[PDB]
Symmetry: D3
Subunit: 153 residues, 6 copies
Amino acid sequence: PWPSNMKQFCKISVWLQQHDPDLLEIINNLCMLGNLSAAKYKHGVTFIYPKQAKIRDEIKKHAYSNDPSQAIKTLESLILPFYIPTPAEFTGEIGSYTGVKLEVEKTEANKVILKNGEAVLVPAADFKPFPDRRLAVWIMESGSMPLEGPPYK
Amino acid sequence: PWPSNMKQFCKISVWLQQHDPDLLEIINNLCMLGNLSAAKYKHGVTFIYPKQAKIRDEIKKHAYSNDPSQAIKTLESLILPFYIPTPAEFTGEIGSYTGVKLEVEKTEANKVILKNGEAVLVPAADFKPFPDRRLAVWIMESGSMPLEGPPYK
Amino acid sequence: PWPSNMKQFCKISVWLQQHDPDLLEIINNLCMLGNLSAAKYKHGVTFIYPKQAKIRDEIKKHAYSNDPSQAIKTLESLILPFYIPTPAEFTGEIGSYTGVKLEVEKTEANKVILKNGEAVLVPAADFKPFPDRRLAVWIMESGSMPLEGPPYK
Amino acid sequence: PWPSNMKQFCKISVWLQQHDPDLLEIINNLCMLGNLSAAKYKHGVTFIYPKQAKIRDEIKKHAYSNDPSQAIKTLESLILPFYIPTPAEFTGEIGSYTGVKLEVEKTEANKVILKNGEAVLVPAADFKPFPDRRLAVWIMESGSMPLEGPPYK
Amino acid sequence: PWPSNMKQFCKISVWLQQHDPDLLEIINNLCMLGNLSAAKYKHGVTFIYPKQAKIRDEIKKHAYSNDPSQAIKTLESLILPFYIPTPAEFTGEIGSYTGVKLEVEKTEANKVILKNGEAVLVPAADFKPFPDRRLAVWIMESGSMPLEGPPYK
Amino acid sequence: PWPSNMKQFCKISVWLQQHDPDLLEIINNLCMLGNLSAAKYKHGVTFIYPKQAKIRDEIKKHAYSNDPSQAIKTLESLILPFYIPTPAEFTGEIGSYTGVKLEVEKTEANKVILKNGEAVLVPAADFKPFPDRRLAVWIMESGSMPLEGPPYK
């Protein structure tokens, strides 16, 4: 009824449960849940959620295929072992669980645009972590996250 | 995965399930499923879906309340025992289950703005009925549907 | 969360779902949902809910058994094609789906003890029908409902 | 646990749920549940279940496609408005919802091979109806049911 | 059917799943599942289940609010990082995951009453752990667990 | 629809979810999920799935009884803390989570037969792990896995 969803999240999965459960089920079925989770010695986690259903559908198609490794690498490109809560923080030697270094083309107050795919990233308006949870969620509005390229140090 | 949602529909409930399952459960729990279904005698069914969760949540609050009569009336005003696929057919003595006559203020080829609540209705971009099934679903972007007023004939 | 259960009811099944969903599934699986529903011709429906899980479990054992005819008979004896809201109306030629006439031993303003099984019935504290819907639900605290005996007229 | 599946059935859908819940959901989503149910006027219902997932998957692909009319036709050819419990009753002017007359090539006491698709039908080892309920379920091991051909009378 | 629930639990969540699933879902959604779980270097776990639905509902209201931290502290006050299986064991420097030390007012053979909230605690009759699982579950029948006060050493 | 199941599994639970969910739920409810999971310092995991529903049903009966320890030991006898992908690998000092050493009676290209229960084991045709996942799943077609006997070193 009136209390559908959570408004503050201690984990990114609770947020993803409320937006694309199927995507979360595939993240779990491919043993990638650990990648979403904040662990000590890891900087924190930032997740890139594809707004466009065509991109998410393609991950699903591949995840249920005879070669799901294509879904693993797309998924690895959407998860950053860094805490990147704002556009200002989206700089330096950072990248996804593919080792690829992300390069910012244009940076705006509430938007980041990336080289190598022209991904348009905006912070997810309804993802609010707890204080001292180092979690972030961005919506990818268009383009694609980089799959290949030179890595970060 | 990729095949999640039906593209064509023989009942509105199957559409509703893909958009607001909670709203569909409440409709069923209030013995109002029959109001969404094409009987022989009944011309057809048009359902108005409130886009702003504010309105859908308020229906859910009232449905699980000690007096659910207000949820029933709101739902009655969102179900039309007439087949109104486009704005051109939105004219004459047509109304909801409440019986209040609908009075259109402006039409706009794909948009309809009604008097008595200033409801703004746009056909649903993902609802196509089976042929020979007189079912329509509109999205109410803003405003509200008429609750009381002169009856239609 | 806070809004979990409906406070008012237009069908007994919605009440049953909040108390014993398994029992409701078995009722449906045995094509006995219709027996809980107010038809035009039928006076009303009163359902007797067995409080002791012992009796509900025994119905479930028998329902999934190779001969479910005994589950059907027990369920028949717990559904009454009459609207009996309080002990005062618990009199005359009234009975269950089996057809055995119910004979009250003691009434007690909010309690009814029947002959032929020593069933102890108390109205359900959380079942209120919509007005003009002739639906009642009693809790059988002990005893059992009549299985066989002289029919009512 | 141990009591999971019903051993006797008053409706085919309860059997289908224990074997292919997805197929049952699609049947319901296509307003074809009524075709599996014994009406007064209708003689009885026999349902043909495709054993090879290849055929059931192809129905699901077509059901969620932009033209589900082909799923409807396949399902029509698997539902028989006649009560055909054994091979001996598989004769005369009997057919599916499509209306094509079924022509048996070989019978074999517990096996039936039809013309016009070479369907191989064997009664389902776990479907027993309630007595006085004219319901049958066969397993199609190979082949396909007739889609088009001369009608039965 | 007849085997509804587990009778012996290796974790407290299996017990809570059978009594208040929603409460368990909120415990998981707030990353408090670890607190219920026995870990080496932790004494063991004791969980206080509020019998009264009004208390549990308030946790839910707060958990789905803009400030769920109120639900976290109520939940922390219901979980004890100690193994406290009987009234005799409910003594000494013990308390919840708020640091607050619990003080016993009256101790009975099957009941404990606490200062600072007048909580009435009785061992949950259907919670039986495995041998050498250091798990306990009490029902809080009335009053409240302490939220604030001097801590244990 | 067409993408029912996963074709490649990073965990054995995803496979078991697609064949006996209830068995998986009981494995989780008895805190035996960890045994299915590959951990560093553990060789790998091999799971023996009983083809025969009578064996799996007996585990369920016992798991929901007052003494579920009988289900724990049967379950321990079905899980091997070794990676055993083929018949050639099924030799040496290996066994289940009971310490009992498995002895091969007859070994075939696609089948292994065991002493002390005459278990007939065949690799599960639809279990394909990822490269460098050390996971295997066999179907036990008849007989039983050893419960008692001399242990492996």
